[PDB]
Point group: C2
Chain length 223, copies 2
């Protein structure tokens, strides 16, 4: 059997929520099935560019700026109102179909559950309320509160200090290889959710546990 963690931290955008509605809005508006993936990776890259060059900017503001950059790469010239409408879909993402059963199972095993997202606190709450997930969490964390994005070590550590749990008793559950990598190097245990279109980072990014869904992560931990 697997040692039970005291604390599980979940990524939200890629791990708990289905970004379908936002992916479709972006791909339809820039007229390419490839726009969303490029936009999201550009957003992430500029968040780390901001923090490395000495700056914290609201993640959603970076999202809007990098969507304007991506729209130009795809030949589109969209109004400010149209861009806000497209990005507003990030507030209206359903949960992946397995998540609620998984979170219920984990809560019944008396593991503390928290969310950690780069998205700002107001937005993160609105997302989790819309998806019907907010009530499962003992706490909901945005990196905004510390001004440092994932995968910076201070992002995970702020949760640990707030929850008063040691790193080695905490497991990060994430669908992004870079999220797994950051948590590992901050000393946390890790579970990769192999959502469609996500890979493990092969340069020392191997997680402790791997499963296809959050529910299968719960079943592996609690078996």
């Amino acid at each position: 059997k697997v040692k039970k963690p005291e604390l599980l931290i979940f990524d939200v955008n890629e791990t708990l929520l289905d970004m379908g509605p936002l992916e479709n809005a972006i791909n339809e508006s820039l007229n390419s099935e490839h726009a969303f993936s490029l936009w999201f990776r550009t957003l992430l890259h500029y968040s780390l560019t901001e923090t490395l060059t000495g700056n914290y900017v609201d993640f959603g503001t970076i999202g809007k700026a990098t969507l304007k950059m991506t729209m130009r790469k795809f030949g589109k010239n969209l109004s400010e109102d149209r861009l806000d409408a497209i990005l507003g879909n990030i507030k209206k993402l359903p949960a992946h179909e397995d998540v609620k059963e998984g979170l219920k199972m984990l809560k019944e095993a008396q593991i503390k559950l928290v969310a950690l997202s780069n998205s700002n606190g107001k937005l993160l709450n609105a997302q989790l309320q819309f998806a019907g997930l907010a009530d499962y969490f003992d706490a909901i964390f945005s990196v905004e509160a510390v001004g440092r994005y994932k995968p910076e070590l201070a992002s995970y550590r702020a949760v640990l200090e707030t929850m008063k749990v040691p790193a080695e008793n905490t497991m990060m559950v994430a669908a992004a290889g870079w999220d797994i990598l950051g948590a590992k190097r901050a000393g946390l245990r890790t579970a990769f959710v192999a959502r469609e279109g996500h890979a493990i980072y092969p340069l020392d990014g191997t997680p402790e546990l791997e499963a296809k869904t959050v529910l299968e992560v719960a079943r592996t931990l609690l078996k």
Copy 2:
């Protein structure tokens, strides 16, 4: 007016055409290269933030292995090395040589700064016929920190012993402009196809469509 020009190599001086074509053809999509390259860039900053320096080309092969499956392909090691090996043999953009000559004749010091490792960077500049324009060629390997970290630009300034305010970074990437700006440098954006300025305080001192037009603006 600048004493020193620092040139980005991969996006600014060199045409990545041969590598973009090899990646896109192997993954059967005109969009694979752009996604792969942005993933490479993101994992490089992930490495430096979580406390590790890794050879940039090692990250590039790793992130190509992550990307290929998104396009339904699982390329062999022999296949990957041949695809990525194209990065050693890129032609210069057609305007670059005349611009660099003009700048060199104006007695402005010219240096190259790339995330690519030093062995690769030098082989690239030789293949392209560009090596002799530069007073010095710098890989971020020497400081163990990638662009756009402050230390990358700063190592060049300290080596050349030129102040930030008399140095101009010439780059086709919005993030490279931003890093150079925040390190105190003057900046010139080369608007190569498919690259934009970053709208959150990323505006360069100068903008032009080519390196030759950057040179002409500087020397007019």
